Amino acid sequence: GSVVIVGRINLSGDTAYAQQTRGEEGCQETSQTGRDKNQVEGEVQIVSTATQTFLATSINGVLWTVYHGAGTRTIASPKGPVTQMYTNVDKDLVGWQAPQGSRSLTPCTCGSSDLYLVTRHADVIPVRRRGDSRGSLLSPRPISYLKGSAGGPLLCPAGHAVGIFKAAVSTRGVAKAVDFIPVESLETTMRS
Ligand SMILES: CC[C@@H]1C[C@]1(NC(=O)[C@@H]1C[C@@H]2CN1C(=O)[C@H](C(C)(C)C)NC(=O)OCC(C)(C)CCCCc1cccc3c1CN(C3)C(=O)O2)C(=O)NS(=O)(=O)C1CC1
Ligand SMILES: [Zn+2]
């Protein structure tokens, strides 16, 4: 089965919003065939397999997401199923060549420690960077609130890509910190 784009998180306006482009029946069918003729736009896609739904984010012309969501699956596209360009299970990372029509987030060079995590419901959650791949949640959210947002972007105050959300440190169902694949690690994967 292919990963299928079923919506987007629009970030170009004053407030973020989620848009649905495909339902359950459409997603199941598109997954089997791997032929998706829908127009792609924006930076953050909402994606699904048959069993899970999550996010994918374009950075440096590659559409990235989490391995624990996508496995080694192809992504459905206009020309049929497209094989993964990158697969790094140790980083919980996969990527495909960004679909035609998509736009990529610019890598952050600010070195800012105030970050912003975008969820699949288009919430923008402030995150304080605490290391290479960690940020603490200033204001926590329960785990159920963040569920399905893996593969989404962490952004800097200027709206650059800082990383890809992959996991949350859960304490009794509440997330106090988030873990992410930094953009620099994405670049390293693209290099060597
Ligand atoms: C709920 C919002 C979370 C973002 C999110 N991710 C998850 O739910 C991932 C999936 C799974 C568990 N997990 C966790 O976040 C767990 C948790 C909360 C369940 C308790 N936390 C944790 O382990 O902290 C420990 C920590 C050290 C921070 C992990 C670092 C990563 C270590 C690591 C390295 C290499 C490979 C792999 C891992 C972990 N890995 C494979 C893997 O499969 O993890 C999600 O929403 N997923 S989703 O619903 O969209 C799903 C459909 C895609
Ligand atoms: Zn920046």
Residue numbers in the entry: 990 to 1181
What do the authors say?
Vaniprevir, with the P2 isoindoline moiety, bound in a conformation similar to danoprevir, making favorable cation-π stacking interactions with R155, despite the P2–P4 macrocycle. Relative to the wild type, R155K caused large reductions in potency for danoprevir and vaniprevir, but MK-5172 remained highly active (R155K IC50 = 0.55 nM). For both danoprevir and vaniprevir, the R155K mutation disrupted the favorable cation-π stacking interactions with the P2 isoindoline moieties, causing significant reductions in drug potencies. R155K and D168A mutations confer danoprevir and vaniprevir resistance by disrupting favorable cation-π stacking interactions with R155. In danoprevir, the P2 isoindoline moiety shifted in response to R155K and D168A mutations, making extensive interactions with the catalytic D81. For vaniprevir, the rigidity of the P2–P4 macrocycle prevented similar compensatory changes. The flexible P2 isoindoline moiety of danoprevir containing a P1–P3 macrocycle packs against the mutated surfaces of A156T and D168A variants, explaining its relatively higher activity against both protease variants. However, the isoindoline moiety in vaniprevir is constrained due to the P2–P4 macrocycle, resulting in significantly lower activity against all three variants. The resistance at R155K occurs due to reduced interactions in the S2 subsite.
